[PDB]
Paper text:
Aj_EasH is a non-heme iron, α-keto-glutarate (aKG) dependent oxidase that works together with a flavoenzyme (EasA) and an NADPH-dependent oxidoreductase (EasG). Aj_EasH catalyzes a highly unusual ring rearrangement to form the 5-3 ring system of the ergot alkaloid cycloclavine 4.
Subsequently, EasH was crystallized in 0.01 M ZnCl2 0.1 M HEPES pH 7.0, 20% (w/v) PEG 6000 and 1 mM aKG. However, the location of the active site could be clearly inferred from the location of the iron and aKG cofactors. The iron in Aj_EasH is coordinated by H131, E133, H209, in a similar fashion to AsqJ (H134, D136, H211) and Cp_EasH (H141, D143, H217). Within this loop there is a short helical segment (residues 52–72), which we refer to as the “lid”. The lid fully occludes the active site of Aj_EasH. Our X-ray structure reveals that the likely substrate binding pocket of Aj_EasH is spacious and largely hydrophobic (the pocket is delimited by Tyr65, Tyr69, Val236, Thr115, Leu119, Leu275, Leu70, Ile227 and Gly136) and, based on the relatively high B factors for the lid (residues 52–72), most probably highly plastic. A neutral, radical reaction intermediate is most consistent with the structure of the active site provided by this crystallographic study.
Numbering used by the authors:
A (entry chain A): 7 to 293
B (entry chain B): 9 to 287
Amino acid sequence: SKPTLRRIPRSAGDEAIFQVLQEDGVVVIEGFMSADQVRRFNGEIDPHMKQWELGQKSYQESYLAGMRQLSSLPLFSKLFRDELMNDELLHGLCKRLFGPESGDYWLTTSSVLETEPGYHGQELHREHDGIPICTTLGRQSPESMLNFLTALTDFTAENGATRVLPGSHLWEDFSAPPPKADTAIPAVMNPGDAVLFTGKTLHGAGKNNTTDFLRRGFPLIMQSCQFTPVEASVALPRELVETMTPLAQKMVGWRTVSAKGVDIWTYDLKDLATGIDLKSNQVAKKA
Amino acid sequence: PTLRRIPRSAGDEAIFQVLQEDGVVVIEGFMSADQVRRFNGEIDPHMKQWELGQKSYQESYLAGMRQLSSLPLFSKLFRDELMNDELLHGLCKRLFGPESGDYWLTTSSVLETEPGYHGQELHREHDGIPICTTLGRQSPESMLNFLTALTDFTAENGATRVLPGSHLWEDFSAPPPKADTAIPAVMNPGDAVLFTGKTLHGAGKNNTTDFLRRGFPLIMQSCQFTPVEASVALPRELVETMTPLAQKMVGWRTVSAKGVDIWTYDLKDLATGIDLKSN
Ligand SMILES: O=C(O)CCC(=O)C(=O)O
Ligand SMILES: O=C(O)CCC(=O)C(=O)O
Ligand SMILES: O=C(O)CCC(=O)C(=O)O
Ligand SMILES: [Fe+2]
Ligand SMILES: [Fe+2]
Ligand SMILES: [Zn+2]
Ligand SMILES: [Zn+2]
Ligand SMILES: [Zn+2]
Ligand SMILES: [Zn+2]
């Protein structure tokens, strides 16, 4: 069935957005971030960007070679820590996706991904293939990941807009070789618009056919708390973590999370934040 | 059926075979007498009662016990001897290598049951992970429990009870039998009862008037699953005293999930990115 990529404003709310996500596996959120947020986030991000270093021999390297990438963005962005990790729409959607089979959720990875002119694109893939039990289960897998992929520049068919196959989250055989990326639908989007897809939906970065345009995307992937994050929370200094809200702290791997009633990521099997005396919403004063 | 026993010297292949067939095996002399003495010496002064009011899966099974967890924080012998043990690593490589790749520590505790302690209901350890509860028998291997006796383990004093073969039963959601139908792992100090997360087991009833029965569960887990014990509780200073391999077990290095690097810094190697020292 030759399907369509649907588009829905941020103001429609999480119920309406979640419904298209269930039916299609992917939806465009218009105005996920405002223009002002995109400007400020870009300002914070610019000076830390660089090329992906080859020689890793990993799953990451197979899909991320040729891209400019920065990850562990809690370390580099106040707007990430304070605005995005407390966003009510993000949390409403995560509660609906992950609540039934997993309970709690948290950040697995977030990156800024900039594709240069001539970048050839990715093969279509499902994001849940980073987790081996989900690869084994295929369609029968529980929901494990949710990717909020925000456009930080214009996203066009020509400049490499992320390509998606609506409905692929419901195909019978997830191990079948995926189709060519050019049969998929590019998520044409203005800055601040985000393409939202589960870890079960076939997608990939498009070919950048321009001569002079750097196409900047912002994947932010939330994950079921029972699965180990791609990005380690031990990289964050305690001092920085203590500037965030309790909820943001929990997303970045410094609080206890409940896996269907099972407390995990604990200190002495009890609450983590209590055990280590973790502070929150700290604000350093000019003194 | 019977609970089988194999000496530590027989090696990982022989031990792994009984584990596949029975889901549970006694390793004679997993730790030496001298290790048990020294480990006990280190552990003694930090023990306390489980605090109620947690409203968790942990609390449902651990109420009434004395417990200490996050044992890398309290024991040099844990950090240096146990986290580098060749037999532990040989068995984990065999259990987890096929479906998961790497593995690491999820939880380890000292569990002391007092006289009168009523025992646990029989349970499978993989029910701490929701996807494994859903899959039941069809679940991939997720956990391996090396449960070492730190005092004598007797039928009467609450030796851990196990049902050999329960890892192969068709229906994992069927209500388990009474704990007193299961076989107690009678053991000397340093012997360990080894079982997968799919095998029905539980701490026994302590029917003595005067014996404190001290067990030492050490649970390794497939790296794709979040640990029960958080690695952010460990200060960096302490982690840097351990070997690279021990560091990896306690959640401070990158682990490979069937070729997928996870627990990374900037998607690259964690230890490199944060400049992590060792030994
Ligand atoms: O059209 C359908 O319902 C799916 C059929 C199909 O692709 C299959 O099961 O092989
Ligand atoms: O950056 C994009 O457009 C897609 C990235 C992606 O799908 C991935 O790297 O897993
Ligand atoms: O300490 C014992 O004997 C068994 C403990 C146990 O099975 C558990 O707490 O999961
Ligand atoms: Fe992807
Ligand atoms: Fe248990
Ligand atoms: Zn609503
Ligand atoms: Zn079919
Ligand atoms: Zn738009
Ligand atoms: Zn051998």
